[PDB]
Design a protein around this ligand. Structure first.
Ligand SMILES: *[C@@H]1O[C@H](CO)[C@@H](O[C@@H]2O[C@H](CO)[C@@H](O[C@@H]3O[C@H](CO)[C@@H](O)[C@H](O)[C@@H]3O)[C@H](O)[C@H]2NC(C)=O)[C@H](O)[C@H]1NC(C)=O
Ligand SMILES: *[C@@H]1O[C@H](CO)[C@@H](O[C@@H]2O[C@H](CO)[C@@H](O)[C@H](O)[C@H]2NC(C)=O)[C@H](O)[C@H]1NC(C)=O
Ligand SMILES: *[C@@H]1O[C@H](CO)[C@@H](O[C@@H]2O[C@H](CO)[C@@H](O)[C@H](O)[C@H]2NC(C)=O)[C@H](O)[C@H]1NC(C)=O
Ligand SMILES: *[C@@H]1O[C@H](CO)[C@@H](O[C@@H]2O[C@H](CO)[C@@H](O)[C@H](O)[C@H]2NC(C)=O)[C@H](O)[C@H]1NC(C)=O
Ligand SMILES: *[C@@H]1O[C@H](CO)[C@@H](O)[C@H](O)[C@H]1NC(C)=O
Ligand SMILES: *[C@@H]1O[C@H](CO)[C@@H](O)[C@H](O)[C@H]1NC(C)=O
Ligand SMILES: *[C@@H]1O[C@H](CO)[C@@H](O)[C@H](O)[C@H]1NC(C)=O
Lengths: 777, 573
């Protein structure tokens, strides 16, 4: 930050200057920030310019001023170079150009002879000029301007005049006027008159002939306006149309005018265009292609860098543009080639084994036939003396007797500080114990009591030397003298795992437990394992509450403030298997239903048997049902359930059992209904009597849903007179039916009757009831 | 470049022999500092006034006393080093005086003993410091009594033991006490005690141990330990030692009535047993030895610089026996739990630091055998924002329709407020452009209208800074054709296709990776080839397929700024 190279702020810009302008001087700017302040030099035409006092060119704070300019000694390209002790940089190339407009030739123009009824071409022949001009035509005398109608075409490219069909009105003298529009005023140049002579008039129409043909290839940059001209001769005047061969034209550009204008060409407009001139006599066609190119841009540049001497570096620079650009490298204002270590490859720079002479300003230059761009950076190499303030050696290095120690010495130095280890005043060297790796790490094995003391690391390099000290003392290692034993239990009266340790008599010793690398909690949330506390050298832990979910890889660890030791053990908890799943009802019959289920978790003990329970929705309790086979084995997954009463809904569940006990019941099965069946219970509550004269009423108790056993439930009542041998059967549909009335005028009052009843459904017939004696009205 | 005082020379304990006629005592103290530090001295708790004049002087930190006396100068001294940053405390140094008094002038009573028994002759040494060495003289100098099995001398009380007196022991006895100081070897006589005896009967008795070593003998590590087992008996009893709970280490086992250990280690703890045995019988005595040590360090704090608004944890651990206690000092004054500082048995916790928590801190570990110190310096820092280390990207590229991240994290303490601005319009969180409260900016579904300049402003109560980047949009590479899976045998040829589209400006590079491993097409005799090589065609062909050529083939189509991939599978039997 104290010193930095020249960084540009303002760079020179191109200037267009009128040759006969009233201005007296031209200013080109160049400014750079530097510390110390930079010095500026200027290059013209690739060579250095003699900045002499008084002689035209003057230097004002970096800027270059040229007074009373002329095209013979000033027009050209200039560069500004900024320099200081760190390095030099070069600004972008700046063009200064002059504009002018000459006068028309004094030689008389020959008269043009043509046939009446034929298109005629009249040249203009503009003089030397820059930039482009605007062209007009006049007839006979100024200011009579020929209108730009459908019969006369005036070209803005060549300035010529085209007449589609000549008649007697076109005879006269023509003149071409140039009105080059300067940015401040307009200068006009008037051409010598040319006489147009016309021969005898013919009488014939003709097909169009296109004369002003736009070039096949037109190159344009992104953001320019592109004009295409298409003029043709023809009687009558042909119509002009523009088409895109490889696409669709914009509606705003689809015009019948003989000129096609694109205000801002983008990457889309690239392709082939076709102009067609059509009349009743025929058509003529022109084809030409428009391409689009751009100017280089940046994608990845370089930045300031500080590197340590003896390292390697890689720099990159990426530019994008159409056509693809080329990238070259400059240092301090001169091109870079493959030197001893510098490797330049078409865009990337490789440094190997940096030195103190490879510092300065580096520039990356991208170039193509439409422009150039520059990018700057600064490389600074550094060399330092060894400093231990960042990684000092351990000031205290406690070590356990019988183990090993490793002490690394790594200072901050360049190129690389070499180190040597010593113990007190005795220099340590390779032996069958002490080891010194090339990195400087000191490794001591088989550590004993006589190795305590003060060790020193000495580092040095061709800058200077540094030095540091540590002290080593020897303790006794913490050891385990008893390890816990693996075990297994179901729900017993709890188990005490043991862990005994011996430590140095000077430092505190703490025991800690863990389960499968998850932290343990010997406190008391609900069921809890607990920990005793009598003396330091004991760590027994008792697993209480006689419950589940307390198995894994138990680990006891005895640790001090310095080192630690550990041992491992395993416990298992056995028990009844888990509940089954996947209860599926199949083969739904009147009394038999097949049940299928998936095997549940065995809990590390094979399942011995199964038990099936059933219930009636919605408030029926779970009841064990008769199963085929009577004893279901653990490996079986299907069974039969018997004893079911037909045509009610049922739900089922499964329980598993092993030699260790009985597991949990499974979830309820899906609601299913058994098939229909014939009735099995005869109706009861037979009674009756009274009614209208000649009528007999028989009443019975309505039957519930448990014994209907199917749909279409109803009753059949067989009744007869006392002493008669013929039974009359009546059908009463409906389960809730409870009475029947039989009407007959021949029935005497208080006539005894013998009756019986039976129940039926859609499946079959059930048993009949006992015969009862009733009386009529 | 400033720091707090760091001690190089600390005061040391001094014992002054009275005999030597020196006129000045020096207690050293030196503390490196920048700027140089001043010194104060504390004498037995209270501060010391070092006014020029009397015998208390100052020689540049070092304290000098002219002509010290026991009545005005014995005691404890501490050195306090102070500079603008903070002050530090030096380890205590004890100044003590050594002297010896003479024996009392009163005559000693004669000792009457009956021949055939052993007799005890007292010495009664006067006041003394340090310990002495004792001898006995018979009648007249230099008749030194030889150290045989019958004439017995104790090195801790000076008493004289006679196992069995006879007629040859009649006479006068005196006790001579000698001191071995650093510069003097003064020795003192005594009076003459007359020993008169009685009749004789030569009977035999069982040994009786009289001089008993104490039941518990506390001994630090590194202190020579002597055990005395003195006995009576007729004839002379024999002395044998044994360890109750192990071996006696017979490298130095002896039959003398004294047992010596030059340097006590932790393995010598336990109970010893002495036995005096003769043909008549035996006597047995027991006693235990316990070892102890001084505090030592295991983890020590180090000087630290912390940024305002942070938190700090500091630890300090000591090892000794009995277990040491740890306390904390700041600027030479005790530090209790208050405000943002928490102290817990050697754990120091700073929460949300400020500019007033900069200074010298110290950790003290002590027990009934010693005290040790450790020091460190804490410096708090506050900084202005700077973007030199982490400037915003300067040439940010963007792919069309993508999402762009722009982080902005300067180097400041405390954290600085961050604002964003495109051109001269300050952005707000919305559905397309959003800022997050760590400073990062997010933009979604980028378009050509977003090209331009972006700027990040950072500011805190010490200053402000800004950094600008340039955002431009391009055309993203998109895959139009993908390869397909196939199966072949060994030696078969297969062809897979891949097509992409990109911006007309940059270059496409097409590659193929077999199971994420790039395929080398330039290998001599290689089995892979590029076919239908065009700008947007990256078809590859495998010739003479092998078993290793079966796997997943991934087509990579990449430019300098973006890439796009497709996948297919090939099996070789
Ligand atoms: C003290 O003994 C140790 C052990 O033999 C020495 O360390 C050994 O150092 C050599 C190099 O002197 C290492 O061999 C070479 O290492 C380079 C590292 O890039 C490697 O490229 C070579 O292929 C070769 O392996 C060797 O690995 C290393 N071994 C160990 C165990 O450290 C040490 O150098 C000796 N002390 C001195 C002062 O030489
Ligand atoms: C260990 O490192 C020091 C630090 O460079 C070496 O230099 C001494 O530094 C102290 C501290 O300022 C000075 O008081 C001494 O005068 C320095 N010595 C010399 C010779 O300049 C020191 O020499 C190193 N130790 C050894 C044994 O070389
Ligand atoms: C508007 O700005 C606010 C803060 O400047 C953003 O709020 C953050 O939202 C995220 C996600 O909900 C939280 O994790 C942060 O804690 C919020 N910051 C604060 C300071 O509250 C918010 O995301 C922005 N709006 C949108 C649409 O993103
Ligand atoms: C963004 O930061 C720059 C500095 O990095 C500011 O530029 C400074 O502007 C002030 C006055 O506007 C000048 O006095 C300083 O000399 C400028 N510094 C440099 C290094 O040139 C800039 O003003 C900041 N932007 C805003 C909006 O404040
Ligand atoms: C530099 O070159 C241009 C074009 O080649 C030329 O017009 C100009 O005269 C040259 N410069 C000088 C000083 O002649
Ligand atoms: C080195 O280790 C071996 C076995 O571990 C041991 O016998 C030997 O005594 C050790 N060396 C020293 C110096 O203690
Ligand atoms: C403490 O120092 C004072 C200063 O002379 C002295 O008088 C006093 O005896 C000392 N106390 C102890 C216990 O040493």
């Amino acid at each position: 930050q104290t010193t930095f190279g020249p960084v540009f702020e303002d760079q020179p810009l191109s200037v267009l200057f009128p040759e006969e302008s009233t201005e007296e001087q031209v200013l080109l700017a160049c400014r750079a920030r530097a510390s110390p302040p930079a010095t500026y030099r200027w290059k013209m035409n690739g060579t250095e310019m003699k900045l002499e006092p008084g002689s035209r060119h003057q230097l004002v704070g970096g800027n270059l001023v040229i007074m009373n300019p002329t095209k013979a000694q000033d027009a050209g390209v200039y560069q500004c170079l900024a320099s200081n002790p760190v390095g030099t940089v070069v600004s972008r190339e700046a063009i200064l150009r002059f504009g002018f407009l000459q006068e028309f030739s004094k030689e008389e123009r020959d008269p043009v002879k043509a046939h009446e009824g034929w298109g005629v071409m009249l040249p203009c022949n503009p003089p030397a000029h820059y930039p482009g001009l605007s062209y007009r035509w006049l007839l006979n005398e100024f200011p009579n301007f020929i209108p730009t109608d459908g019969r006369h075409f005036v070209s803005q490219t060549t300035g010529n005049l085209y007449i589609a069909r000549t008649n007697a009105s076109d005879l006269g003298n023509y003149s071409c006027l140039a009105t080059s529009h300067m940015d401040f005023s307009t200068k006009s140049v008037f051409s010598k008159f040319a006489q147009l002579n016309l021969a005898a008039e013919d009488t014939r129409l003709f097909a169009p002939s296109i004369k002003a043909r736009f070039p096949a290839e037109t190159y344009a940059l992104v953001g320019q306006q592109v004009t295409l001209e298409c003029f043709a001769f023809g009687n009558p005047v042909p119509r002009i149309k523009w088409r895109k061969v490889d696409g669709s034209l914009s509606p705003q550009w689809t015009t019948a005018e003989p000129t096609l204008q694109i205000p801002s060409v983008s990457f889309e407009d690239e392709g082939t265009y076709e102009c067609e001139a059509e009349n009743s006599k025929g058509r003529d066609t022109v084809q030409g292609r428009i391409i689009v190119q751009a100017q280089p841009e940046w994608l990845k540049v370089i930045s300031d860098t500080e590197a340590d001497i003896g390292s390697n570096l890689r720099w990159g620079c990426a530019a994008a543009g159409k056509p693809r650009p080329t990238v070259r490298w400059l240092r301090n204002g001169e091109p870079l080639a493959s030197q001893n270590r510098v490797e330049v490859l078409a865009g990337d720079l490789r440094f190997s084994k940096l030195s103190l002479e490879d510092s300065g300003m580096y520039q990356c230059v991208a170039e193509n036939k439409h422009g150039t761009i520059y990018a700057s950076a600064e490389l600074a190499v550094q060399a330092l003396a060894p400093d231990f303030r960042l990684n000092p050696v351990r000031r205290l290095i406690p070590a356990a007797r019988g183990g090993e120690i490793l002490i690394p010495c790594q200072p901050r130095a360049a190129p690389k500080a070499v180190v040597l280890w010593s113990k007190g005043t005795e220099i340590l060297v390779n032996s069958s114990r002490v080891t010194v790796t090339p990195d400087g790490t000191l490794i001591i094995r088989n550590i004993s009591r006589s190795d305590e003391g003060k060790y020193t690391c000495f580092a040095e390099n061709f800058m200077g030397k540094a030095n540091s000290t540590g002290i080593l003392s020897v303790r006794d290692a913490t050891k385990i003298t008893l390890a816990p034993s693996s075990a297994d239990i179901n729900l017993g009266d709890n188990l005490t795992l043991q862990c005994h340790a011996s430590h140095d008599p000077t430092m505190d010793l703490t025991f800690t437990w863990t389960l499968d690398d998850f932290p343990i909690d010997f406190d008391k949330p609900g069921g809890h394992y607990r920990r005793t506390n009598v003396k330091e050298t004991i760590g027994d832990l008792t697993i209480l509450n006689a419950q589940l979910r307390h198995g894994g890889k138990y680990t006891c660890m005895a640790q001090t403030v310095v080192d630690s030791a550990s041992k491992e053990a395993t416990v298992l908890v056995r028990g009844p298997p888990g509940p089954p799943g996947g209860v599926v009802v199949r083969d739904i019959g009147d009394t038999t239903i097949q049940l299928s289920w998936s095997r549940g978790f065995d809990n590390h003990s094979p399942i011995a048997k199964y038990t099936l329970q059933a219930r009636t929705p919605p408030a029926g309790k779970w009841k064990q049902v008769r199963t085929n086979p009577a004893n279901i084995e653990g490996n079986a997954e299907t069974a039969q359930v018997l004893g079911l009463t037909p045509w009610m809904d049922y739900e089922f569940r499964v329980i598993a059992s092993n030699i260790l006990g009985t597991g949990e019941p499974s979830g309820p099965s899906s609601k299913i209904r058994t098939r229909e069946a014939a009735p099995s219970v005869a109706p009861s509550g037979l009674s009756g009597g009274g009614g209208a004269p000649g009528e007999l009423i028989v009443n019975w108790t309505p039957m519930s849903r448990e014994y209907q056993n199917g749909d279409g439930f109803g009753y059949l009542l067989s009744f007869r007179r006392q002493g008669s041998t013929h039974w009359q059967t009546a059908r009463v549909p409906g389960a809730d039916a409870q009475y029947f009335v039989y009407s007959n005028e021949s029935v005497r009052p208080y006539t005894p009757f013998e009756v019986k009843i039976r129940s039926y459904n859609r499946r079959g017939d059930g048993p009949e009831s006992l015969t009862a004696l009733v009386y009529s009205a």
